Design an enzyme around this catalytic site. Structure first.
Site, PDB file in Angstrom:
ATOM      1  N   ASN A   1      27.112  -6.919  10.959  1.00  0.00           N
ATOM      2  CA  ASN A   1      27.618  -6.111  10.084  1.00  0.00           C
ATOM      3  C   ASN A   1      27.136  -4.801   9.501  1.00  0.00           C
ATOM      4  OD1 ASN A   1      30.117  -7.795   9.244  1.00  0.00           O
ATOM      5  ND2 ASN A   1      28.364  -9.189   9.035  1.00  0.00           N
ATOM      6  N   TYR A   2      25.839  -4.748   9.553  1.00  0.00           N
ATOM      7  CA  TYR A   2      24.952  -3.535   9.093  1.00  0.00           C
ATOM      8  C   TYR A   2      24.157  -2.814   9.894  1.00  0.00           C
ATOM      9  CZ  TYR A   2      25.668  -5.413   4.372  1.00  0.00           C
ATOM     10  OH  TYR A   2      26.588  -5.792   3.392  1.00  0.00           O
ATOM     11  N   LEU A   3      24.240  -3.210  11.265  1.00  0.00           N
ATOM     12  CA  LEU A   3      23.521  -2.493  12.498  1.00  0.00           C
ATOM     13  C   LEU A   3      24.259  -1.890  13.516  1.00  0.00           C
ATOM     14  CD1 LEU A   3      20.512  -5.301  12.565  1.00  0.00           C
ATOM     15  CD2 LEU A   3      20.394  -2.625  11.461  1.00  0.00           C
TER      16      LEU A   3
ATOM     17  N   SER B   1      23.220  -8.999   9.320  1.00  0.00           N
ATOM     18  CA  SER B   1      23.063  -7.521   9.436  1.00  0.00           C
ATOM     19  C   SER B   1      23.275  -7.167  10.620  1.00  0.00           C
ATOM     20  CB  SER B   1      21.354  -7.137   9.146  1.00  0.00           C
ATOM     21  OG  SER B   1      20.598  -8.265  10.077  1.00  0.00           O
TER      22      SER B   1
ATOM     23  N   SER C   1      20.422   0.300   9.337  1.00  0.00           N
ATOM     24  CA  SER C   1      20.546   1.219  10.515  1.00  0.00           C
ATOM     25  C   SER C   1      19.396   1.834  10.889  1.00  0.00           C
ATOM     26  CB  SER C   1      21.839   1.815  10.846  1.00  0.00           C
ATOM     27  OG  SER C   1      22.828   0.802  11.110  1.00  0.00           O
TER      28      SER C   1
END
Ligand SMILES: CC[C@@](O)(C(=O)O)c1cc2n(c(=O)c1CO)Cc1cc3c(CN(C)C)c(O)ccc3nc1-2
Ligand SMILES: [Hg+2]
Length: 565
Positions: A522-524, A519, A395
């Site tokens: 799920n990651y950002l 990403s 992030s």
DNA sequence: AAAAAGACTT
DNA sequence: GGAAAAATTTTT
DNA sequence: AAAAATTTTTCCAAGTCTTTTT
């Protein structure tokens, strides 16, 4: 309607819901035996197989094209499971898989695939309508005052397991899930779903401490599979929002944590040094918290806390770089992680100690596991765990890169290239690598020809303007001047079209071996993206598709151009 | 504990 | 999820 | 129309972290 659950008072601790009602899962259609003219052969002689054994045989037949069916492990597991399905008479004749002939079964299935893509509009539309009504009847559930969509209400049909990477259980049979294997969860006041006639559920419970609707045990790994609500739901969304909020809190204390583990590299106790070094890897290289796994039950992959001596190579000097650590190993999904990273001197010296008196198969971090590491992280910050670092680092990298790469004057297509490059920097970091698109990568030739066609139109427009200007000199007037104007405009539109194609060409090239999907979803922190879109006037639909727009509704509505992760 | 299980996340 | 299908759409 | 390039669904698992057992 559109319920903005994010505006509601945060759901309490412990209890997941108060009311829950749903119609249960949708079972896969029963197995249809092969028609009379599709023969099976054993030892060169025709042989009719009973439904149970014939079904397992069809799975193998449909996979005949794949190289993995030639594999030892696959064939061993397959035949052992197929044998359990046979009648005693069938088991006496079929002693091995190699004498079997699935050719006709294989051809039949390919023929059905061809026949299906030749159906009428009447057939096709009808099939689509049966699906839609199945979605209306079983794709929704009621959870506390609201109706919400269920993610995978249709239970996957039976088949053969393959897994990812070099799996010890490939070839095994994933048996048909029956109502008898099903555990239903709902509130004590809801209408309990009825199992298909002549069947009974394994169990009907009322556990409001969990979020699942249906659960059952799968036979391969012996784990519990679930039917849960979809990403756009409040129960999933609120948890996702909390995940990002946790990552943000980590932001305000990460330097404090970094200073501490750097000092820990010097501690008198070995366990403390290992914990500090592991933390360093998880933070700097965003490695996963490698939880130990049962040998011979899963593919051999590793994370940070499960690295073996053989997974790293120490180099005092490499490429003119000092203290280089060479990581080479298979991570999640058997995706290879290869990286030569220059580290701090004390880390290099520590790694040399961690590799002293050990065999290549031994753990690099003995006296260390995910439980101990997370227990420590929990001390540093409430709710902090190993994976929070991945969310934080991904992030913060996106936000920072979007801030540094976005040019105020660039048109939408160019801004999208910038967004994609920022996302790509996150992907590379998370090692979300990909193999070049199955020879279909040559579609780059298709874009190149298009760009060359456009370069020709542009060049043609340049001659028009070139001659329009020449004609403007001889007998200079406002009539010819407006023609020079209209020619310049035509050159402009063509330059933009070309620019757009060239940008798309660059986007694809740089994204050849990278997977952005994981990403992105799920990651950002979606708010970072939403803020960026609103700030530069980039329609959110250019970045998030329909399903993604539904999953991130909370962020799209609740996040202004000034949001800062 | 420390495996084993269960319930989420990626 | 991400490669393979399948449904569409575009090229020819 | 017919082949080719795209855009869109369909198929299929593996980790992390928490909670119970032994
Ligand atoms: C491919 C990347 C990844 O493994 C990952 O760790 O990065 C993954 C895989 C899968 N999913 C994801 O969101 C993600 C990305 O975060 C969801 C998903 C569902 C799958 C289902 C469907 N189930 C849950 C009913 C399968 O049956 C088998 C394999 C599946 N694989 C995946
Ligand atoms: Hg990351």
């Amino acid at each position: 309607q559109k319920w903005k659950w994010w505006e509601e008072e945060r759901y309490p601790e412990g209890i997941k819901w108060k009311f829950l009602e749903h119609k249960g899962p949708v079972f896969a259609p029963p197995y249809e035996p092969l028609p009379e003219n599709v023969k099976f052969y054993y030892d060169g002689k025709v042989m009719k197989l009973s439904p149970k054994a014939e079904e397992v045989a069809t799975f193998f037949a449909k996979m005949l094209d794949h190289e993995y069916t030639t594999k030892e492990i696959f064939r061993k597991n397959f035949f052992k499971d197929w044998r359990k399905e046979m009648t005693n008479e069938e088991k006496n004749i079929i002693t091995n898989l190699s004498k079997c002939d699935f050719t006709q079964m294989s051809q039949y299935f390919k023929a059905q695939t061809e026949a299906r893509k030749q159906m009428s509009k009447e057939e096709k539309l009808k099939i689509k309508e049966e699906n839609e009504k199945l979605l209306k009847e079983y794709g929704f559930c009621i959870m506390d005052n609201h109706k919400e969509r269920i993610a995978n209400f249709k239970i996957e049909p039976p088949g053969l397991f393959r897994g990812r990477g070099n799996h010890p259980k490939m070839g095994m049979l994933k048996r048909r899930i029956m109502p008898e294997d099903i555990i239903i969860n709902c509130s004590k006041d809801a209408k309990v779903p009825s199992p298909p006639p002549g069947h009974k559920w394994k169990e009907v419970r009322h556990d409001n401490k969990v979020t699942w609707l249906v659960s059952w045990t799968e036979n391969i790994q012996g784990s519990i599979k679930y039917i849960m609500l979809n990403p756009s739901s409040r129960i999933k969304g609120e948890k996702d929002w909390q995940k990002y909020e946790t990552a943000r809190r980590l932001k305000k204390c990460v330097d404090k944590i970094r200073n501490q583990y750097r000092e820990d590299w010097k501690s008198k106790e070995m366990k403390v040094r290992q914990r500090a070094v592991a933390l360093y890897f998880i933070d700097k290289l965003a490695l996963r918290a490698g939880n130990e796994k049962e040998e011979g039950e899963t593919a051999d992959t590793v994370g940070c806390c499960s690295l073996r001596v053989e997974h790293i190579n120490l180099h005092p000097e490499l490429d003119g770089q000092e203290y280089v650590v060479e990581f080479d190993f298979l991570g999640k999904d058997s995706i290879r992680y290869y990286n030569k990273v220059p580290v701090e001197k004390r880390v290099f010296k520590n790694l040399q100690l961690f590799m002293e008196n050990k065999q290549p198969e031994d753990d690099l971090f003995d006296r260390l596991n995910t439980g101990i590491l997370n227990k420590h992280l929990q001390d540093l910050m409430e709710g902090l765990t190993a994976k929070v670092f991945r969310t934080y680092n991904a992030s913060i990298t996106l936000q920072q890169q979007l801030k540094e790469l976005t040019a105020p004057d660039e048109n939408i297509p160019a801004k999208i290239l910038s967004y994609n490059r920022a996302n790509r920097a996150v992907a590379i970091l998370c090692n979300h690598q990909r193999a070049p698109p199955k020879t279909f990568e040559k579609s780059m030739m298709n874009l190149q020809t298009k760009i060359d066609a456009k370069k020709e139109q542009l060049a043609d427009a340049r001659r028009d303007l070139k001659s329009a200007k020449a004609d403007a000199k001889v007998m200079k007037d406002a009539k010819t001047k407006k023609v020079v104007e209209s020619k310049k405009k035509a050159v402009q539109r063509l330059e933009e079209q070309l620019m757009k194609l060239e940008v798309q060409a660059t986007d694809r090239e740089e994204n050849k071996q990278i997977a952005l999907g994981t990403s992105k979803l799920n990651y950002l922190d979606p708010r970072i993206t939403v803020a960026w879109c609103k700030k530069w006037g980039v329609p959110i639909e250019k970045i998030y598709n329909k399903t993604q727009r539904e999953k991130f509704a909370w962020a799209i509505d609740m996040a202004d151009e000034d949001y800062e992760f």
